[PDB]
Design a protein around this ligand. Structure first.
Ligand SMILES: O=C(NCCc1ccccc1)c1nc([C@@H]2CCCN2C(=O)c2c(F)cccc2F)[nH]c(=O)c1O
Ligand SMILES: [Mg+2]
Ligand SMILES: [Mn+2]
Length: 178
């Protein structure tokens, strides 16, 4: 799985994921399913931000904490939207709302509820993807067009099929905890 991750994800993504794990005392060479999941969520966030017009989204995920909050507080001051309690993943300039992106090995409805319970921001939009083509978003408002979402869902399916061909999928799919 460590070899899978290093060959299927961009080195910038891999470096950010290693750093995120090491900041919590986790070793990417040992907790390899977590390593893979962090990389996958990063790639989905970056794909999502590419899915609209140029300048539609600001990326918050993948930044160090100081810069991430600088972006969030700057947007709140400039647009007046409510400041979130936790860092979200994107800001949507067209809809004027923060977005929390989730990628789940379980089922999108469970994960959506967990994310809504945790962030409890009311104003933050939640958009969930699975590895088997399901998605679930706040108010069935999926933000992007069907073509962009299909490209994300196809990428996740491709990751799943690649892990399975290496007998990695069974362990990864059962590694997500509530
Ligand atoms: O922004 C996020 N975490 C930053 C703040 C953060 C850091 C640590 C714990 C909670 C929040 C974020 N985290 C997740 C999942 C679930 C929560 C942890 N986690 C990680 O990936 C992760 C990680 F962050 C650090 C170390 C190891 C990890 F496994 N899922 C998202 O969808 C998402 O946006
Ligand atoms: Mg995040
Ligand atoms: Mn997220």
């Amino acid at each position: 799985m460590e070899d899978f991750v290093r060959q299927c994800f961009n080195p910038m993504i891999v470096e950010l994921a290693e750093k995120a794990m090491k900041e919590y005392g986790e070793d990417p060479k040992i907790e390899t399913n977590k390593f893979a999941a962090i990389c996958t969520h990063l790639e989905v966030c970056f794909m999502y931000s590419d899915g609209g017009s140029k300048h539609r989204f600001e990326i918050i995920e993948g930044r160090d904490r100081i810069m991430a909050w600088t972006v969030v507080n700057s947007i709140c001051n400039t647009t007046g939207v409510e400041k979130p309690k936790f860092l979200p993943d994107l800001y949507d300039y067209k809809e004027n709302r923060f977005i929390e992106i989730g990628v789940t090995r379980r089922e999108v409805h469970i994960y959506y509820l967990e994310k809504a319970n945790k962030i409890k921001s009311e104003k933050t939009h939640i958009h969930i993807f699975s590895f088997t083509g399901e998605e679930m978003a706040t108010k069935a408002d999926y933000t992007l067009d069907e073509e962009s979402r299909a490209r994300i869902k196809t990428r996740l399916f491709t990751i799943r099929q690649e892990m399975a061909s290496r007998s990695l999928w069974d362990s990864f799919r059962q590694s997500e905890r509530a």
